[PDB]
Structure 1
């Protein structure tokens, strides 16, 4: 098997060694600049609290696996997990409501937990001064990891299986040739490798710069304090590091707690963000590293801890009879969005990262990476962990610094899923931005792009709207980053004509004599059709899982424009094209460009779309001028445009693409043409609700690599008859009808209880699914939610969706909910 070098003998790198070994890959060298007995990264100081419950399904499965593995990781009859459970307490109404949402995550992801009353909290954790406790969330399977001990036992069992450990060995560079890794440099010459995995914790960026790779993590310090012996605790625990009470979270004050014998450990994020320059740390001579003297531990700054110490004494008064014994400012990693950084680099074949990973998720990440390395894919969706998810503006040191600090500042906050950052904003805007501002655009952002969710100009339309379009009141939570205005935009889209900004849609140009050959192998469609055809198709992995759903427009013999889902797709195409070019003839070369930023697109949609466009174009837009899912070049308002006839909102019209410098003119020409037809600008709130009424899938939530096309209801898009395509062999014999799990459309019975995503779904009182996407449907006048459900659950069955602790009755409904016979889309 391939020669693997792992950089880092933290909890990540030693778990990864371990996960590779058990899969038969043992040609591994593990390097660490610290001594093997105590390498001295963040793992060497972590207190090891593990709270599994997480808004993210993947992160939650990573934590569940880590708990399982640490419990099994044992020597002299002592495991590496002490399963005391975990308790998060609420001291405000906002937090108590949020614990109900978190209990929802628990059930969604298969973690057992309960909400505790104030009295039951006191019974479980008598040290709590009960006066400000409104409630708790108790997960019995949570607990304390012994991460440093786990590292030592992983080293020992992997060593026996052939893995080589070199402590006191500093990586100073990475050797490469022809765009693949060939070795790792040390002052002692090069260690050959076919695969390098950087498991270097908060040194990740420094390692990354050695190959020109932006690794978007920031090292940040976080205070951890142990008290002196707490009188109330005398005699209760085994010394020196026993614990019997659940690990304790006090998220309203940025604090968490564990016992260490009769002492308390207090973790505080209740301080200013503290960026750390890794180049200033110094080279620690290995012989010098000890528990208080290691690169990860900076001097304690007591002044930062004072407020945390007061809140502690308030929550746990017994602690007022102890003192602060020892504290440090410990360094670990943060990232712009709080997700880890995993996967193959863009810059260098065979070079991977598994960085910015808490002890909590370590074994999970290791296992995914081991699957990635040995089989070509991870069994768990890595959409939110892949290093290549980031856009170029999100990779600058300044972006990483500013947003990673804000993620530290907010780490324990209750936040709505649509909550935008206040800064940095306005990084990327489409060419319609000034016009969007004139119309009172309410902008949210993703990928650096500013995106209108609705337009305040259209509030003037609410008085004219037919009552059937008026939605009911929303609760405060579903009402955040939402507006009644979206009803009006949905209304006008369904009955007049609307202009949506499609500019942020990932746009890739795949070009050259090998373009068709590349796309024919990567996609599930037969793309060898005369130019003009637009095909909705999938990208799969070799296990048939859905990596993406895409459109491919063939603009000429050698030129294809793809509408993709984000930069994981870009990176996927980039590498696949480079590999075909390198091992092909002069007829296989192919380039991939991300042209998103240099172009723009208006989705011009609704029943008056042809009336509008005919005023500013002499091109033929009739059905016989341009059929559904066809593209051609046209001129609109004097601007050359590529017109594609499809609509993610389910109405007549076209995506109109042009170069950025032309976009404002193209916008103004249409806007003016559309005055007599009541044209509006329409934003993402309406867009999302309308596409949901159409049943159209959104990659990353409605389906990921954990789903095959037939489970996702996307069989129509797989052309099984193709000689060859990635995933074909895996999908032999499967059908939608025979899928054990299927994506179902739910409508909410009461017409008004909106859900948002991730809420667990119960059939006959058992958790069998979870909301993937949802919105209020303005056309059907009810909340809609999607969920996978067991194949045995049928159209017309009834299911419950738990939202903030309350069961909401919904019915499995046939989709599309709107115009399933596509009457609005054809001729």
Structure 2
């Protein structure tokens, strides 16, 4: 049976594609067609070791893991197929004090999630895994009720479920070409016939890049090699009544599990030693590859084999049955690309899975929800397909994938920095000027200063779970901005120009704030139909009907995609241009900001003439700039929008003009300190698709009664009338040597009641500041709670925000006070 017309065509029949097909149809979508080149599981899926753990070091990916595991538990009763899901639990091993710290870090990040997770003692570990060498074990990170699954049986079960709900799965039926239509639908060609599809989804494993090239896209993926070793029966293992838990020996860099009555273990060897398929990127995947392995290579993993033999002694006497060497499809940062793709209509991807077996279930549900409802069910911008860009070259991808492979089990510190592939091409002249003067941070391809070196203080990367070498420098930079004037490179912003006949009306319906009048700027949010915060933008009305929109580097294409889809879906006639890479931006902030800049322009920068949030085009020392009086520091300041080629010159002229004022640099770490004191929310931390703007405390920017029927308007009215269950608040807390950064558990009377979203040290009050979600009944100023940082609870107090009033507020207070006193 062939369907010539489909609602959705899924390309690829690995666990990921089949999971998506199952979910879409289970949720009621008719005419789902999956096309598979040869047979189900023919890519990476069939050879996988099948490890499926509740553990993830991130945040919302925990939900993907959780959803997969709960699904895999249900599949047998649903389909009649046994999936071979072994659930003995999983233990990550710590042998160093720093790894014990990593576990404590991970615990505070996990106690506000449903994920059941514990730090356990050597005694408990030996009881669970009695064939373990306890020599050097200090602790374990334990998730009960997870383990490993048969990837073949799992896929078959999902296929059976899919067919039950009406999915047509066709194989062999390789997609050979894909052509878009003007109405946004698709023509799909296979040797078995063609399909007209309303949408297409790429889930083609290590052919994902070949599939994307069919529609003119270059997906940044590369197949890496990975090996596990399987042993024959081991008498001691056979003799066990209970199945052994899955282990990860982190110091040894391998995982290990029971396989029948023997053992299976997989190393992640070093960057220098690991192999990857650069030839497949250069020349394509070889035709006829399929259900196939690479030649085994025991030699390159020797160190980890020897490590395993000392850690689990019985491996010394065991024989090797098999060594499985097979391809895994990696993206640069190890995480998949999951979602709708910018720049092409109705094309979705689920590609680049480093851990597809654990992810397939949860991602299938997530992506099904997004397709069916028009918004992500929860925030997973860390998987966004369009976090990558033109800077993500094949060279970059190869180096970064090699790094992500080798770093599989290194200690994960906060404020982690990785250096492979850097710097990319995404830099101005300012990079060369500043690079030796500061610690450059990586953000969506850009190099952005985090903090600036001080003479006689350590300039090295020194990652830590506690305060480290940038602590004093950051305080210096805070003082610089508060007392004098600082310059910061803000060039990484996403930047879009919107004009054309319907520009105002498009923005008016996308955005929850009013649209600013010509010559003015405001802060405005793009909400989802359910009233979630998809984006926070700064909107500048530069000339009649022509706007500049500014967003964070991490949200550039995520936000552009949403805008472009709304425009075409709504029949709006506009011109949208992504000028992100055309422009640099310098922030000049602090009480001397006006004095310095006034020396360089005929434009009147006085308080009464150049008002807060005005935007004007002018010249700074003959360099054309668009200047907005605004600053995320909350001090007096202008953001100076200019051509990238002029960045180095503009910076030089400002720094020379500010010498008398003691002008100096500041970076993003100090910026975070400053914005937190002002209680400024950050998209991605305080709000995202998980939050409505009312619980986030963004109501000042929300105009529920503006005429335009903006997206999310009705949902938000309902939310407001019903009343909030939680609220974002600001906490202060004394600590000894560690500051909150967000994602930490908040406790009250022995129970977890919320979480921090961001944090800093406040140098002005000499204690820590954090934003946090807490129940509304526990959200009053003066309320006491506790924040869990590295295995210790610190008393915290809700404060009246902001800690420090902004410059415009202070200026208004003085102006009003003088007027009143003059009576």
TM-score using structure 2 length:
0.92
Shift of 1:458: 7.7
Provide closer, same or farther for how the CA distance between residues 348 and 503 of structure 1 changes in structure 2, counting only shifts above 3 A. Answer: closer
Distance 1:160 1:434 in 2: 60
1:22 corresponding residue in structure 2: 26
Q: Which residue number corresponds to residue 766 of structure 2?
A: 781
Task: Name the CA distance, whole Å, in 1 between partners of 2:696 and 2:627.
Answer: 29
C-alpha spacing 1:162/1:261, structure 2 compared with 1 (3 Å): same
Moved more, 765-774 or 677-686: 765-774
Residues 107/736 of structure 1: CA separation in 2 closer, same or farther (3 Å cut): farther
Q: Once the 2 structures are TM-superposed, how far is the Cα of residue 729 of structure 1 from its aligned partner?
A: 1.8
Match of 1:57 among 52, 56, 59: 59
Residue 818 of structure 1: aligned partner = 804
Matches within 5 A, 1:561-640: 561-566=548-553, 568-570=555-557, 572-573=559-560, 576-577=563-564, 580=567, 584=571, 588-640=572-624
What SS does the aligned partner of 2:105 have?
helix
Contact 1:489–1:682, Cα closer than 8 Å, also in 2: yes
Question: Per the alignment, do residues 825 and 125 of structure 1 end up closer, same or farther by CA in structure 2, a change over 3 Å counting?
Answer: farther
SS at match of 2:142: strand
In structure 2, what is the Cα distance between the partners aligned to 1:750 and 1:412?
30
Alpha-carbon distance change, 576 to 677 in structure 1, aligned in 2, over 3 angstroms: closer
- Counterpart of 2:49? 47
Take 1:384 and 1:804, find their aligned partners in 2: how far apart are those partners?
24
Pair 1:398–1:61, CA change in 2 (3 A): same
- Residues in 2 aligned to 1:578 and 1:364: alpha-carbon distance in whole angstroms: 25
**SS of corresponding position for 2:409:** coil
Deviation, structure 1 residue 530: 3.3
Q: Give the CA deviation at 1:774.
A: 1.1
8 Å Cα contact 2:627-2:641 kept in structure 1: yes
What is the CA-CA distance between 1:450 and the residue it aligns to? Answer: 1.4
CA gap of 1:161–1:375, structure 2 versus 1, over 3 A, is same
Measured in 2, the distance between the counterparts of 1:310 and 1:179 equals 60
SS in 2 for 1:626: coil
1:557 equivalent in structure 2? 544
1:763 matched to 2:765? The reply is: no
Instruction: After superposition, give the CA deviation of every residue in 1:411-453 in whole Å (9 maximum; x if it has no partner).
Output: 1111323232223223233343344247x22212212211112
From 378, 383, 407, the counterpart of 1:380: 378
Deviations 1:382-431 (A, max 9, x none): 2111101223202x222111111111111111132323222322323334
Residue 663 of structure 1 aligns to a residue whose secondary structure is helix
- Alpha-carbon spacing, 1:48–1:778, altered in 2? closer, same or farther (3 Å): same
Q: Check if 1:339 corresponds to 2:326.
A: no
Say whether the 8 Å CA contact 1:736–1:742 is kept in structure 2.
Answer: no
Q: What are the superposed Cα offsets for residues 529-559 of structure 1, whole Å, 9 maximum, x if unpaired?
A: 4311101000111111101111000100132
CA contact under 8 A between 2:529 and 2:715: conserved in structure 1?
A: yes
Match of residue 515 from structure 1: 503
Q: Distance in 1 between the 2:793 and 2:570 partners?
A: 57
Task: Answer yes or no: is the 8 Å Cα contact 1:486–1:686 preserved in 2.
Answer: yes
Query: Comparing 516-525 with 314-323, which one deviates more in the overlay?
Result: 516-525
Kindly report which structure 2 residues correspond to 1:346-357, keeping only aligned pairs within 5 A, or say none. 346-357=342-353
Aligned to 1:311: 307
Matched residues, number: 793
Q: Does 1:3 align with 2:4?
A: no
Matched, 1:479 2:467: yes
2:414, 2:465 within 8 Å by CA — same for their partners in 1? no
Equivalences for residues 386-397 of structure 1 within 5 A: 386-394=384-392, 396-397=393-394
Query: 1:476 offset after TM fit, Å?
Result: 4.3
The alpha carbon displacement at 1:484 in A equals: 0.8
Alignment-derived partner of residue 240 in structure 1: none
How far 1:306 moved relative to its partner?
Answer: 2.5
The aligned residue for residue 424 of structure 1 is 421
In structure 2, the partner of 1:275 is: 276
Change (3 A) 1:692 1:701: same
2:526 alignment partner, one of 539, 563, 581: 539
CA separation in 2, counterparts of 1:191 and 1:481?
59
Matches within 5 A, 1:714-729: 714-722=698-706, 723-729=708-714
Shift in alpha-carbon separation, 1:573–1:113, aligned structure 2, 3 A: closer
1-side partners of 2:532 and 2:331: how far apart? Answer: 27
The Cα of 1:596 is off from its aligned counterpart by 2.6
Equivalent residue in structure 1 for 2:659, among 675, 686, 694: 675
Q: In the superposition, relative to structure 1, how do residues 180 and 575 fare at CA in structure 2: closer, same or farther (>3 Å)?
A: farther
For 1:8 and 1:368, the matched residues in 2 are separated by 18
What is the CA–CA distance in structure 1 between the aligned matches of 2:161 and 2:13, rounded to whole Å? Answer: 14
1:502 paired with 2:490, answer: yes
Go from structure 1 to structure 2 and tell me whether the alpha carbon gap of 1:665 and 1:306 turns closer, same or farther (over 3 Å shift): closer
Preserved contact between residue 604 and residue 654 of structure 1 (Cα < 8 Å): yes
For residues 463 and 737 of structure 2, the distance between their equivalents in structure 1, rounded to whole angstroms, comes to 10
Alpha-carbon contact 1:497-1:604 (below 8 Å) kept: yes
Equivalent positions of 1:120-199 (< 5 A) are 120-178=124-182, 180-199=184-203
Q: Distance in 2 between matches of 1:475 and 1:615?
A: 41
Q: CA deviation at 1:105?
A: 2.7
Name the stretch that deviates more: 315-324 or 604-613: 604-613
Q: CA deviation at 1:56?
A: 1.9
Asked if the contact 2:88/2:144 (under 8 Å) is kept, the reply is: yes
Q: What CA deviation, in whole Å up to 9, does each residue of 1:579-600 have, x standing for no partner?
A: 636975xxx5322222232222
Structure 1 residue runs without a partner (length 5+) = 238-242, 461-473
In structure 2, distance between residues paired with 1:269 and 1:570: 33
CA shift, 1:812, in A, is 1.8
Matched, 1:686 2:670: yes
1:2-48 deviation digits (Å, cap 9, x = unpaired): 61111122211111111111211131111112324xx3222212222
Q: Whole-Å Cα distance in 2 between the matches of residues 475 and 186 of structure 1?
A: 51
Paired residue for 2:68? 66
CA distance in 2, matches of 1:664, 1:475: 30
> Cα deviation per residue 1:626-655 (whole Å; 9 max; x = unaligned)?
111111122222222211111100101211
Matched, 1:367 2:365: yes
Cα displacement (A) at 1:566: 3.2
Aligned mates of 1:234, 1:751 — CA distance in 2 = 50
Q: Which residue of the partner structure matches residue 468 of structure 1? A: none
Which of residues 286, 290, 301 in structure 1 aligns to 2:297? 301
Structure 1 pair 437–736 and aligned structure 2 pair: CA distance change class (3 A): farther
Alignment of structure 1 residues 406-425 onto 2, 5 Å: 406-425=403-422
CA contact (8 A) 2:696 2:727 kept: yes
Whether contact under 8 Å (2:207, 2:285) holds in the other structure is no
Check the 8 A contact 1:458/1:485 in 2, yes or no.
Answer: no
Q: Deviations over 1:201-231 (max 9, x none)?
A: 2221121111112222221111011111112
Partners of 1:204 and 1:67 in 2: CA distance: 26
Distance 1:770 1:579 in 2: 33
Cα distance, 1:53–1:797 mapped onto 2, change above 3 Å:
farther
Q: Distance in 1 between matches of 2:233 and 2:243?
A: 16
Counterpart CA distance in 2 for 1:254 and 1:628 is 54
- Compared CA separation, residues 268 and 590, structure 1 to 2 (3 A): same
For the structure 1 residues 494 and 751, does the alpha-carbon distance in structure 2 shift closer, same or farther, using more than 3 Å as the test? farther
In structure 2, the CA distance between the partners of 1:20 and 1:454, relative to structure 1 (3 Å rule), is same
The answer to whether the 8 Å contact 2:740/2:770 transfers is yes
SS for the counterpart of 2:383 is: coil
Question: Is residue 260 of structure 1 aligned with residue 259 of structure 2?
Answer: yes
Match of 1:707 among 691, 700, 709: 691
Corresponding residue of 2:819:
none
**Cα offset for 1:480?**
4.2
